[PDB]
């Protein structure tokens, strides 16, 4: 695959060099030709990307997204010179779709611990912000929403990388606990702050899943860190308390209810699987099971006014 | 070796920052210094490029050409501010010969099957086009010749990498043959479209050599794909037929005949070598030889009208 | 550690797009926010860099320095566009601190022979020059100090890589010694020319250390080349002779004296250790030791003119 992706890069390079030639010579039919070329690239690239997400290779998907960005960049240059609304609508649609797709991939990359690809994904996301910002600087709230999602992902990377460093460095389980506790608290305060300004339903849905995936990664790494059953329990309880409190902000609707549910259920499943793997006695399994059930009871009772 | 080339890069970038300093300070002698330093880079880079021309390390050749591009770019900025012709005369000639040389390297890379370096080279060629169009935006025929050669090389790379992907997937011989046939058909039609505009004699030789190298790569890949002796024979005759058709559609001098028919005979020799290696019965070897000799007769009987 | 460093890169890219956004909206509050965040990035990177200085991992230090320069770019954009002199001051200070640090690191990299990192460092030094040049293009004396040091480093690296290339391709020790003498003479000429312009004590400290490290590299490379004791003596005397002459130029003060002799003594100690390791006879050990003591006797005699 990669060489075909690089042929798209060469076509986009030739289009960009052609777009300098069009800026210098002024032929509107040359702008039409590079617009057609860039759409054909955009098709080829989206086909490779939709294949890549079915195949599960995130590196290929991120390469394809960066090509979609590069194609969107020259489309934005053509739209900036020509003033054509069809190109502006296409670029906005493609970029908004790419933002959602890269967000899904970023959730995957953080949830699967492949933070190197997540860093590349955030890099691509910044370029998507450049595309969106060049497309409409006045329609600012969508940029503010994207930047909030980015700040949330950055906060998740800060917690993730701080803990990954601590995992390499072999610190005491009590230091690992206090760092994870501090991390989950800081994540709560950031989620609370973001929830002041955001209002896109899908953005809130994304944000909750990101908070959940960050907590899940923190617990999985802490458990791979060989912590005591007592640490595993206290951290799981704190994580349930966070997931519950952030759900009491975000659980506005059937989707956000079902999302908070699936997340708390996933956290319970993970907690129990780790308690089984360490061989913790049945009372700790009961205590965690109760905490999970009681959290879902609280959320479904709390949300019962909204439906 | 590469560290030498990196010292040239550091020299060029120091010159480039010195050319920002020259744009801010206005000193003619500073422009004269960076111009001289860039010619000293051109000396050093040309010298290593001649070494690579002998030794066949294409990666070094491309690296040296990239330095020649970088040097030409700063020379173009120096000359565009200073208004001097001699730096533009040097840049134009150096770029034109570098374009031919990188095309010859790219033909070699396609013939060797290192499409990775060929892609990198084609990017360098597109960057030579940035130098060319910055040198003059109205020298359009040279830019058109470059773009035509580029699109031919891309069409060849698309056919090549598609068929190599069929080799990686383990596709059936009949599908492999339909893709190879489609590739030759598309190449023939593109070459006929290009023949409506191009008028550099060496560019016509380049185009024929590219079509021939693409057919050669297709033949070698189809042989590695394990196609039957009958399919190899049908491909060989169809390929020679296309090569004969393209030879008639391009050739316009006895020297162009010498080149084209030498290339045809080379492809026929490879076809015979493949049938010999596969152990195909002598009647198939005769059939291919007859087709080759009939192409010789036809291109003789056509070519004797050009002279 | 590279995850943390790349996290800082993402913070910087997010800030850079935020600095596009702040220039599109026209609000100083976001410029304060990116300035704050960039200063925290600078503190984080500086902390990692001084840590890397203690650990001895030059690749991490150079990565961190490039991040400091990347942060300095967005800081310089804010300090240029908002016009706040306290940002200009903090940027200029950070850039000058980085310049000294990267020069000392580059001297270390040359002294250890890891010239790949020295090339990267010198690239970063070009980036520091971009920051300095954008900060104040009329600060011409500081710019000239950086240029002179750069020219010296480039000349030293040219000799170094010429000699390493000669070792890599193979040569008779006679040609290696003839190149080494030509290198020491080029170093003498360039150092003499630079010493006509430069005045700063830190610049003297840098310059002599670089010349000394270049002689040290030349000597250690001839030792890796396995040259006979006669060639080792001949280069040792000529190298001490150049170091003595360059000391007679640069030794303006007790500090520059102290440096020059410490370096000379080190070069002699290396020379005697190579005579010890190659098993040179006791009379040759004495002859070289006497020559070294006579160089000390000359640094004593000459430097006392300024006591």
Q: What is the 3-state secondary structure (H, E, C) of chain C?
A: CHHHHHHHHHHHHHHHHHHHHHHHHCCHHHHHHHHHHHHHHHHHHHHHHHHHHHHCCHHHHHHHHHHHHHHHHHHHHHHHHCCCHHHHHHHHHHHHHHHHHHHHHHHHHHHHCCHHHHHHHHHHHHHHHHHHHHHCCCCHHHHHHHHHHHHHHHHHHHHHHHHHHHHHHCCCHHHHHHHHHHHHHHHHHHHHHHHHHCCCHHHHHHHHHHHHHHHHHHHHHHHHCCCCHHHHHHHHHHHHHHHHHHHHHHCCCHHHHHHHHHHHHHHHHHHHHHHHHHCCCHHHHHHHHHHHHHHHHHHHHHHHHHC
Are B225 and B176 a contacting pair, CB within 8 Å? yes
Q: Tell me how close the Cα of C195 comes to any Cα of chain B, in angstroms.
A: 20
* Residues of chain C with C-beta less than 8 angstroms from the C-beta of B9: 123
d(CA C185, CA C176) in angstroms, rounded, equals: 14
Cα distances from B288 to residues A156, B217, B226, B241, B274, in angstroms, run 66, 18, 19, 11, 11
**Cβ distance of C157 and B7 shorter than 8 Å:** yes
**Cβ distance of C11 and A123 shorter than 8 Å:** no
The DSSP result for A125-156, as a single string, is HHHHHHHHHHH-SSSTHHHHHHHHHHHHHHHH
A147 has a chain C CB within 8 A of its CB? yes
Are B67 and B41 a contacting pair, CB within 8 Å? yes
Q: Tell me how close the Cα of C58 comes to any Cα of chain B, in angstroms.
A: 18
For B304, the 3-state DSSP assignment is coil
* Residues of chain A with C-beta less than 8 angstroms from the C-beta of C67: none
C6 has a chain A CB within 8 A of its CB? yes
Chains within contact range of chain A (3+ C-beta pairs < 8 Å): B, C
Structure tokens that stand for B49 in this block:
């490029």
B50 has a chain C CB within 8 A of its CB? no
d(CA C88, CA C134) in angstroms, rounded, equals: 10
Among positive and negative, which fits the CA dihedral A177, A178, A181, A186? negative
A286 has a chain C CB within 8 A of its CB? no
C136 has a chain B CB within 8 A of its CB? no
- By the 10 Å C-beta count (0-12 exposed, 13-18 middle, 19+ buried), C118 is classed as buried
Q: Tell me how close the Cα of A98 comes to any Cα of chain B, in angstroms.
A: 26
Q: What is the largest CA-CA distance in chain C?
A: 79
Are A223 and A235 a contacting pair, CB within 8 Å? no
HSE of C18, CA atoms in CB hemisphere, 13 A: 26
For B206, the 3-state DSSP assignment is helix
Q: What is the resolution of this structure in A?
A: 6.8
Cα distances from C267 to residues B52, B171, C192, C255, in angstroms, run 38, 67, 20, 18
Q: For residue B126, which of B108, B107, B139, B143 has the smallest C-alpha distance?
A: B143
Among positive and negative, which fits the CA dihedral C132, C133, C135, C137? positive
Nearest CB among B130, B147, B157 relative to A7 is that of: B157
**Cβ distance of B133 and A21 shorter than 8 Å:** yes
Which of the residues A129, A141, A169 would you substitute to probe the C interface, choosing the one with the greatest number of C C-beta atoms within 10 Å? A129
Cβ neighbors of A139 (< 8 A, separation 6 or more) are none
Cα distances from A91 to residues B76, B184, C70, in angstroms, run 34, 35, 29
* Residues of chain C with C-beta less than 8 angstroms from the C-beta of A164: 3
Q: What's the distance, CA A100 to chain centroid?
A: 8
* Residues of chain C with C-beta less than 8 angstroms from the C-beta of A140: 25
A14 has a chain B CB within 8 A of its CB? yes
Q: Tell me how close the Cα of A306 comes to any Cα of chain C, in angstroms.
A: 37
Cα distances from B100 to residues B129, B136, B146, B207, C134, in angstroms, run 12, 18, 10, 12, 39
DSSP class of residue B279 equals T
Structure tokens that stand for C264 in this block:
């000379």
Q: For residue A187, which of A238, A130, A253 has the smallest C-alpha distance?
A: A238
Cα distances from C305 to residues A72, A149, C127, C247, in angstroms, run 70, 69, 41, 13
The experimental technique behind this entry is: cryo-EM
Q: What's the distance, CA B220 to chain centroid?
A: 19
**Cβ distance of C133 and B3 shorter than 8 Å:** no
Nearest CB among C3, C6, C14 relative to A150 is that of: C14
* Residues of chain A with C-beta less than 8 angstroms from the C-beta of C9: 123
Q: What's the distance, CA A144 to chain centroid?
A: 15
Nearest CB among B116, B122, B130 relative to A10 is that of: B122
Rounded CA Rg of chain C: 23
For A304, the 3-state DSSP assignment is coil
d(CA C151, CA C164) in angstroms, rounded, equals: 19
Q: What is the largest CA-CA distance in chain B?
A: 78
CA angle C171, C177, C178 (to 5 degrees): 95
A143 has a chain C CB within 8 A of its CB? yes
- CA torsion angle for C50, C56, C62, C68 (degrees, to 10)? -10
d(CA B146, CA B132) in angstroms, rounded, equals: 10
Nearest CB among B123, B130, B147 relative to A10 is that of: B123
C11 has a chain A CB within 8 A of its CB? yes
**Cβ distance of C24 and A150 shorter than 8 Å:** no
Nearest CB among B116, B123, B129 relative to A3 is that of: B116
Q: Tell me how close the Cα of B124 comes to any Cα of chain C, in angstroms.
A: 22
**Cβ distance of B161 and A7 shorter than 8 Å:** yes
Structure tokens that stand for C234 in this block:
């001949």
């Amino acid at each position: 695959d990669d060489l075909l992706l690089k042929l798209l890069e060469l076509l986009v390079e030739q289009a960009r060099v052609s777009a300098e030639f069009a800026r210098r010579q002024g032929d509107e039919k040359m702008l039409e030709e590079v617009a057609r070329k860039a759409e054909e690239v955009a098709r080829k690239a989206e086909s490779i990307a939709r294949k890549a997400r079915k195949e599960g290779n995130l590196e290929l998907a991120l390469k394809a997204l960066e090509i979609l960005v590069r194609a969107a960049h020259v489309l934005a240059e053509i739209a900036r010179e020509r003033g054509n609304e069809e190109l502006q609508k296409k670029a906005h649609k493609l970029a908004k779709e790419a933002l959602r797709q890269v967000i899904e991939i970023a959730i995957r990359a953080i949830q699967e611990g492949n933070l190197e690809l997540a860093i590349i994904a955030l890099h691509i996301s910044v370029r998507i912000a450049e595309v969106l910002l060049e497309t409409r600087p006045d329609d600012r709230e969508e940029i503010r929403e994207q930047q909030a999602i980015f700040e949330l992902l950055i906060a998740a990377l800060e917690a993730a990388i701080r803990l990954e460093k601590l995992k390499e460095e072999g610190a005491p389980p009590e230091q690992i606990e206090r760092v994870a506790e501090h991390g989950l608290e800081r994540l709560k305060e950031i989620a609370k702050e973001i929830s002041k300004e955001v209002d896109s339903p899908e953005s809130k849905r994304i944000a909750y899943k990101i908070v959940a995936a960050a907590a899940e990664f923190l617990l999985k790494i802490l458990a791979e860190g060989g912590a005591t059953p007592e640490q595993l329990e206290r951290v799981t309880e704190h994580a349930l308390e966070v997931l519950k409190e952030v759900a009491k902000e975000l659980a506005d609707s059937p989707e956000s209810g079902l999302a908070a549910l699936a997340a708390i259920a996933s956290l319970a499943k993970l907690g129990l699987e780790q308690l089984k793997e360490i061989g913790a006695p049945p009372e700790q399994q009961r205590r965690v099971t109760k905490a999970g059930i009681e959290a879902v009871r609280e959320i479904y009772r709390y949300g019962r006014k909204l439906y």
